[PDB]
Design an enzyme around this catalytic site. Sequence first.
Site, PDB file in Angstrom:
ATOM      1  N   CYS A  76       0.836  -1.214   0.000  1.00 57.59           N
ATOM      2  CA  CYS A  76       0.000   0.000   0.000  1.00 57.59           C
ATOM      3  C   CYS A  76       0.850   1.236   0.000  1.00 57.59           C
ATOM      4  O   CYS A  76       1.556   1.574   0.996  1.00 57.59           O
ATOM      5  CB  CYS A  76      -1.004   0.069   1.193  1.00 57.59           C
ATOM      6  SG  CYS A  76      -2.029   1.563   1.124  1.00 57.59           S
TER       7      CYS A  76
ATOM      8  N   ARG B 284       0.028   4.763   2.691  1.00 59.39           N
ATOM      9  CA  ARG B 284       0.026   4.504   4.142  1.00 59.39           C
ATOM     10  C   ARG B 284       0.347   5.724   5.008  1.00 59.39           C
ATOM     11  O   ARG B 284       0.189   5.673   6.196  1.00 59.39           O
ATOM     12  CB  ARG B 284       0.931   3.315   4.481  1.00 59.39           C
ATOM     13  CG  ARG B 284       0.309   1.962   4.196  1.00 59.39           C
ATOM     14  CD  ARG B 284       1.307   0.874   4.555  1.00 59.39           C
ATOM     15  NE  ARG B 284       2.340   0.723   3.536  1.00 59.39           N
ATOM     16  CZ  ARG B 284       3.456   0.023   3.689  1.00 59.39           C
ATOM     17  NH1 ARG B 284       3.742  -0.558   4.853  1.00 59.39           N
ATOM     18  NH2 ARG B 284       4.308  -0.102   2.657  1.00 59.39           N
TER      19      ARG B 284
ATOM     20  N   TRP C  86      -9.241   6.382  -1.151  1.00 60.33           N
ATOM     21  CA  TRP C  86      -9.493   7.113  -2.389  1.00 60.33           C
ATOM     22  C   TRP C  86      -8.469   6.682  -3.439  1.00 60.33           C
ATOM     23  O   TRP C  86      -7.452   6.065  -3.120  1.00 60.33           O
ATOM     24  CB  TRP C  86      -9.451   8.619  -2.206  1.00 60.33           C
ATOM     25  CG  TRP C  86      -8.193   9.151  -1.565  1.00 60.33           C
ATOM     26  CD1 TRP C  86      -6.932   9.377  -2.145  1.00 60.33           C
ATOM     27  CD2 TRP C  86      -8.042   9.526  -0.176  1.00 60.33           C
ATOM     28  NE1 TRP C  86      -6.045   9.880  -1.209  1.00 60.33           N
ATOM     29  CE2 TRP C  86      -6.658   9.982  -0.004  1.00 60.33           C
ATOM     30  CE3 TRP C  86      -8.896   9.530   0.924  1.00 60.33           C
ATOM     31  CZ2 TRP C  86      -6.184  10.440   1.228  1.00 60.33           C
ATOM     32  CZ3 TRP C  86      -8.397   9.966   2.153  1.00 60.33           C
ATOM     33  CH2 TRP C  86      -7.081  10.447   2.281  1.00 60.33           C
TER      34      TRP C  86
ATOM     35  N   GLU D  55      -4.495   3.743 -10.954  1.00 55.14           N
ATOM     36  CA  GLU D  55      -5.330   2.551 -10.779  1.00 55.14           C
ATOM     37  C   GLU D  55      -6.435   2.461 -11.833  1.00 55.14           C
ATOM     38  O   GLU D  55      -6.665   1.387 -12.392  1.00 55.14           O
ATOM     39  CB  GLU D  55      -5.938   2.498  -9.375  1.00 55.14           C
ATOM     40  CG  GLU D  55      -4.891   2.512  -8.267  1.00 55.14           C
ATOM     41  CD  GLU D  55      -5.558   2.552  -6.891  1.00 55.14           C
ATOM     42  OE1 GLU D  55      -6.014   1.450  -6.456  1.00 55.14           O
ATOM     43  OE2 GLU D  55      -5.595   3.643  -6.242  1.00 55.14           O
TER      44      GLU D  55
HETATM   45  C1  HEM Z   1      -6.260   6.467   1.343  1.00 48.10           C
HETATM   46  C2  HEM Z   1      -6.169   6.306   0.028  1.00 48.10           C
HETATM   47  C3  HEM Z   1      -5.405   5.146  -0.479  1.00 48.10           C
HETATM   48  C4  HEM Z   1      -4.622   5.119  -1.709  1.00 48.10           C
HETATM   49  C5  HEM Z   1      -4.356   6.204  -2.743  1.00 48.10           C
HETATM   50  C6  HEM Z   1      -4.104   3.739  -1.592  1.00 48.10           C
HETATM   51  C7  HEM Z   1      -3.345   3.252  -2.704  1.00 48.10           C
HETATM   52  C8  HEM Z   1      -3.192   1.836  -2.942  1.00 48.10           C
HETATM   53  C9  HEM Z   1      -2.634   1.345  -4.206  1.00 48.10           C
HETATM   54  C10 HEM Z   1      -2.222   2.097  -5.446  1.00 48.10           C
HETATM   55  C11 HEM Z   1      -2.490  -0.078  -3.975  1.00 48.10           C
HETATM   56  C12 HEM Z   1      -1.974  -1.103  -4.950  1.00 48.10           C
HETATM   57  C13 HEM Z   1      -3.291  -1.791  -5.285  1.00 48.10           C
HETATM   58  C14 HEM Z   1      -3.482  -2.086  -6.712  1.00 48.10           C
HETATM   59  O1  HEM Z   1      -2.658  -1.700  -7.565  1.00 48.10           O
HETATM   60  O2  HEM Z   1      -4.500  -2.720  -6.953  1.00 48.10           O
HETATM   61  C15 HEM Z   1      -3.001  -0.357  -2.619  1.00 48.10           C
HETATM   62  C16 HEM Z   1      -2.990  -1.711  -2.072  1.00 48.10           C
HETATM   63  C17 HEM Z   1      -3.460  -2.023  -0.744  1.00 48.10           C
HETATM   64  N1  HEM Z   1      -3.929  -1.085   0.105  1.00 48.10           N
HETATM   65 FE1  HEM Z   1      -3.985   1.007  -0.038  1.00 48.10          FE
HETATM   66  N2  HEM Z   1      -4.529   2.923  -0.584  1.00 48.10           N
HETATM   67  C18 HEM Z   1      -5.277   3.781   0.132  1.00 48.10           C
HETATM   68  C19 HEM Z   1      -5.988   3.401   1.343  1.00 48.10           C
HETATM   69  C20 HEM Z   1      -5.995   2.097   1.971  1.00 48.10           C
HETATM   70  C21 HEM Z   1      -6.802   1.794   3.155  1.00 48.10           C
HETATM   71  C22 HEM Z   1      -7.734   2.752   3.876  1.00 48.10           C
HETATM   72  C23 HEM Z   1      -6.427   0.411   3.463  1.00 48.10           C
HETATM   73  C24 HEM Z   1      -6.940  -0.457   4.570  1.00 48.10           C
HETATM   74  C25 HEM Z   1      -7.428   0.076   5.694  1.00 48.10           C
HETATM   75  C26 HEM Z   1      -5.505  -0.049   2.401  1.00 48.10           C
HETATM   76  C27 HEM Z   1      -4.848  -1.355   2.350  1.00 48.10           C
HETATM   77  C28 HEM Z   1      -4.231  -1.869   1.155  1.00 48.10           C
HETATM   78  C29 HEM Z   1      -4.054  -3.331   1.028  1.00 48.10           C
HETATM   79  C30 HEM Z   1      -4.339  -4.470   2.024  1.00 48.10           C
HETATM   80  C31 HEM Z   1      -3.485  -3.413  -0.312  1.00 48.10           C
HETATM   81  C32 HEM Z   1      -3.052  -4.663  -1.083  1.00 48.10           C
HETATM   82  C33 HEM Z   1      -4.160  -4.992  -2.063  1.00 48.10           C
HETATM   83  C34 HEM Z   1      -3.942  -6.377  -2.647  1.00 48.10           C
HETATM   84  O3  HEM Z   1      -3.022  -7.103  -2.238  1.00 48.10           O
HETATM   85  O4  HEM Z   1      -4.707  -6.732  -3.569  1.00 48.10           O
HETATM   86  N3  HEM Z   1      -5.296   0.976   1.443  1.00 48.10           N
HETATM   87  N4  HEM Z   1      -3.505   0.802  -1.963  1.00 48.10           N
HETATM   88  C1  Q16 Z   2      -8.251   0.595  -0.009  1.00 45.22           C
HETATM   89  C2  Q16 Z   2      -7.713   0.866  -1.393  1.00 45.22           C
HETATM   90  C3  Q16 Z   2      -7.512   2.171  -1.854  1.00 45.22           C
HETATM   91  C4  Q16 Z   2      -6.982   2.364  -3.147  1.00 45.22           C
HETATM   92  N1  Q16 Z   2      -6.767   3.592  -3.687  1.00 45.22           N
HETATM   93  N2  Q16 Z   2      -6.724   1.291  -3.904  1.00 45.22           N
HETATM   94  C5  Q16 Z   2      -6.879   0.011  -3.468  1.00 45.22           C
HETATM   95  C6  Q16 Z   2      -6.542  -1.140  -4.436  1.00 45.22           C
HETATM   96  O1  Q16 Z   2      -6.540  -2.501  -3.964  1.00 45.22           O
HETATM   97  C7  Q16 Z   2      -7.400  -3.271  -4.807  1.00 45.22           C
HETATM   98  C8  Q16 Z   2      -7.003  -4.737  -4.714  1.00 45.22           C
HETATM   99  C9  Q16 Z   2      -7.781  -5.505  -5.760  1.00 45.22           C
HETATM  100  C10 Q16 Z   2      -6.776  -6.182  -6.698  1.00 45.22           C
HETATM  101  O2  Q16 Z   2      -6.450  -7.435  -6.100  1.00 45.22           O
HETATM  102  C11 Q16 Z   2      -5.808  -8.373  -6.962  1.00 45.22           C
HETATM  103  C12 Q16 Z   2      -5.220  -9.448  -6.099  1.00 45.22           C
HETATM  104  C13 Q16 Z   2      -5.311 -10.762  -6.555  1.00 45.22           C
HETATM  105  C14 Q16 Z   2      -4.736 -11.767  -5.763  1.00 45.22           C
HETATM  106  C15 Q16 Z   2      -4.808 -13.202  -6.232  1.00 45.22           C
HETATM  107  C16 Q16 Z   2      -4.106 -11.439  -4.543  1.00 45.22           C
HETATM  108  C17 Q16 Z   2      -4.048 -10.102  -4.110  1.00 45.22           C
HETATM  109  N3  Q16 Z   2      -3.441  -9.792  -2.922  1.00 45.22           N
HETATM  110  N4  Q16 Z   2      -4.597  -9.139  -4.906  1.00 45.22           N
HETATM  111  C18 Q16 Z   2      -5.548  -5.313  -6.576  1.00 45.22           C
HETATM  112  N5  Q16 Z   2      -5.639  -4.833  -5.194  1.00 45.22           N
HETATM  113  C19 Q16 Z   2      -7.382  -0.218  -2.194  1.00 45.22           C
END
Ligand code: HEM
Ligand code: Q16
Lengths: 407, 411
Positions: free
Chosen positions: B108, B111, B280, B285
């Site tokens: 993330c 953070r 947000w 993305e």
């Molecule tokens: C506040 C605005 C936020 C922005 C701009 C942000 C941005 C991102 C981005 C760019 C990713 C990579 C995900 C992707 O490419 O699909 C991500 C992943 C992640 N974020 Fe954040 N995030 C935010 C808030 C949060 C919040 C509030 C949480 C949890 C309380 C969180 C937990 C995670 C987790 C667990 C992942 C990994 C997703 C996965 O493995 O699929 N994010 N976030």
């Molecule tokens: C909370 C939040 C804010 C923000 N701006 N963006 C996000 C994006 O997280 C979305 C989640 C959905 C896709 O998941 C794909 C995926 C597939 C698999 C097999 C594992 C894994 N960890 N993640 C990419 N990350 C989450």
Amino acid sequence: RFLKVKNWETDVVLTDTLHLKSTLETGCTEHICMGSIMLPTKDQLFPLAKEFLDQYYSSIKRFGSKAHMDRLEEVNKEIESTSTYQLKDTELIYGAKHAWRNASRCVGRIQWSKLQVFDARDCTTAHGMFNYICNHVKYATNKGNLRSAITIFPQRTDGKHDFRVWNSQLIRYAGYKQPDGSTLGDPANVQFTEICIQQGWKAPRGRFDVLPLLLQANGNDPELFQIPPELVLEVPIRHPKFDWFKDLGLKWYGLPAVSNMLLEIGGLEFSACPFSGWYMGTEIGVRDYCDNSRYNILEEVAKKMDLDMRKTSSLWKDQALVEINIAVLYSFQSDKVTIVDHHSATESFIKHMENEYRCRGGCPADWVWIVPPMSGSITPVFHQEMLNYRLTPSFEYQPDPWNTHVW
Amino acid sequence: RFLKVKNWETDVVLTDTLHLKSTLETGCTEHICMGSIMLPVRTKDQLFPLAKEFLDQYYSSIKRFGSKAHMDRLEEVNKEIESTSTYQLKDTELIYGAKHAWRNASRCVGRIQWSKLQVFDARDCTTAHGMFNYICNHVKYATNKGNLRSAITIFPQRTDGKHDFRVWNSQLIRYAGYKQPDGSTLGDPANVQFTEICIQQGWKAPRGRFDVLPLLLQANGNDPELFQIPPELVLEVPIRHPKFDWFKDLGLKWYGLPAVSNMLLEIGGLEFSACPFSGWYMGTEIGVRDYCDNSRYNILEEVAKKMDLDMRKTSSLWKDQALVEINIAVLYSFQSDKVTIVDHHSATESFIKHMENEYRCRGGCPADWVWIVPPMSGSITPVFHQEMLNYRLTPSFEYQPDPWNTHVWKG
Ligand code: HEM
Ligand SMILES: Cc1cc(N)nc(COC[C@H]2C[C@H](OCc3cc(C)cc(N)n3)CN2)c1
Ligand code: HEM
Ligand SMILES: Cc1cc(N)nc(COC[C@H]2C[C@H](OCc3cc(C)cc(N)n3)CN2)c1
Ligand SMILES: C[C@H](O)[C@H](O)[C@H]1CNc2nc(N)[nH]c(=O)c2N1
Ligand SMILES: C[C@H](O)[C@H](O)[C@H]1CNc2nc(N)[nH]c(=O)c2N1
Ligand SMILES: [Zn+2]
């Protein structure tokens, strides 16, 4: 133990078995992944020799043949007696091709088997090294139709008689620290440029001065040589749309040729093994030109384009980046100097991975290095899972020799 | 042991000690790095150490380590585990735990915001209808008419693994995808399978290119149930370009609220299998991945066509050129409608300051470079040049398999 890698764009799953031959260590543990860290005797030598000769003899369908055994015997006798051994030409060539084949950070490996290997093991002096290098440069450049090559100097002995090319690449631009605090030319080479100046080089103090070669034969203090200007092929950088682009006064050299790495074949160490291929466009136009600690040209370009530089969200940096990269590719193409773009190179590497999976049981690949520094997810490598591990023969980093050399 | 990371643009060197508190595995060994692999019923046995570690961390965060309150809480949790086999978090520990799972989320980039998270405690929830109500409240609160607020809603924890609360949607808001008989896809290809389940369960599909999916909600291990989020709660942004007036005519829009609903929150050994959280968007993305992945909306060709770029050779960089324009359009459209969004320059710059601050005050910041680096313009962002150490800290968010693969149907 049998590992799967999946492409998330195409769902293709490949099974890796090759990793089980992995010899060296990665820097990672079960507790910590170091994937993004840039750098994570007679008794020793015979297993390494054997491991190599076994893969060599297996590669020519002669595993377990007398000629195999006999060579193990011969090398064994030779290590016992001399504490080292000499590779046959055939082994040297195979070893070098495979060091490229195993280079997990190289997107260009579809080419691995077309490598011209110049055996310079009979070299004894810095002047000889200079000769071998000029021949390498001319052969590889081939008037713009570039051909991959490596020149291999004598192997390490006691480690006080190392051959080294002090340069990091055969062809690079000088960097000069200035009164006004800024940097003229390539800031990545400032230190090496000073080592040249202090060893005698008369620098022209310009933005794009080809550095002289600083060559160390046989553990002696290194010596300076200017590559015949006529052998250094350069490209003036213009844009197919923007007339003003040429006014920037940008150029780059055609031959990327790494000269600071160490080639390990069957336990033997070749500390001077300059090797060269051709460029992928992004190396120059994204990294060389746009890194903040490099030529750092984004600001000036964006200015010429009259973009709104007020706010990062206008994506002016991103816009200028694309155009600069279009120009690099256009200029090399127009001057007929071999170049590959990142779309084409990464598509080739996916094809290569599939070939290596089918034919070898895997392909070590370092995703952090393989994904281009621009437009990552629109290239297929981004969506491709990769396993990274270390196979030998290999190329390895080695420390810069001025930090080591006893004068 | 101390570990150093270096930034190759600034030469700044940081020292990681936090990694000493990691115990979950990475997937890597001394012989293989699995850093680009997407995926590299607890007994009392394992539960009390996990509870104790957690409460030790919580009690330290509040400067009450070793206090009578600390000790009494340990004794109280211990008895509760041994007599009921599980335990309940106090509200304060729930909040702290949820915040830290975010703080610990190494993929993330957002953070810097970890400590501003609104935690909605939904552990008194018992039915799918109750889950629907909590989720609507979370959507409205988080959305805040475009001025987005981070939030998480936490449904009851796992008990025997036969009574799980699950949101079957991968995200609370997402568009339907439909495979057509001719092999083309209408709408978002990523959601075809889930869309088919919704239809099967009785959803009447509008069958357009941007139909907001119904919620599919499982309470207490029961069969999931369908609900339509009130459209007035679903904030959406039509996509236009500041200079290219034909861009609106591509008919693109996107939703404002990114809300992950399929991950598992682990706190002190407890497992919260339904814990939708939202923030947000970072512009990329949507503009890079959602729009331009080949397996998603895949609009690069149509955009470059409309731009009349040279399309006959990749080395024109027509794809790169069209990609930047689309991303300008996404940021422009969100900003013009006053919906929170961050660009990838701003987000990565903030992440670097966050990561440095974390190294000083916390002794580390686990970070997955493969994910932190944006999917366009990688090396013109400061994160590309930053060495990172990836390791697993709890509390944590974890992947869990899609529920349709595991669910035991009742009928
Ligand atoms: C506040 C605005 C936020 C922005 C701009 C942000 C941005 C991102 C981005 C760019 C990713 C990579 C995900 C992707 O490419 O699909 C991500 C992943 C992640 N974020 Fe954040 N995030 C935010 C808030 C949060 C919040 C509030 C949480 C949890 C309380 C969180 C937990 C995670 C987790 C667990 C992942 C990994 C997703 C996965 O493995 O699929 N994010 N976030
Ligand atoms: C909370 C939040 C804010 C923000 N701006 N963006 C996000 C994006 O997280 C979305 C989640 C959905 C896709 O998941 C794909 C995926 C597939 C698999 C097999 C594992 C894994 N960890 N993640 C990419 N990350 C989450
Ligand atoms: C034929 C054209 C070639 C292309 C387009 C190519 C492409 C690349 C690229 C893009 C990198 C990343 C390096 C960077 O970003 O600085 C790379 C790294 C590397 N390549 Fe290749 N390459 C080619 C030929 C070769 C040859 C002939 C060899 C060896 C004989 C080789 C061995 C390596 C090694 C060892 C690295 C990593 C260097 C390091 O660790 O800094 N390359 N190459
Ligand atoms: C053979 C070849 C072809 C081609 N198209 N491009 C290349 C570029 O490789 C150049 C080499 C020099 C820089 O060295 C960076 C570096 C620094 C350090 C400390 C270690 C390491 N392994 N690599 C980046 N890679 C090499
Ligand atoms: C810190 C990080 O490992 C470092 O910046 C790497 C990232 N990926 C790279 N990739 C390539 N091809 N070349 C590089 O120099 C780097 N630098
Ligand atoms: C195989 C590879 O790890 C996979 O494509 C990852 C790469 N990096 C990523 N980074 C982000 N932010 N999101 C992703 O979905 C991915 N996908
Ligand atoms: Zn690793």
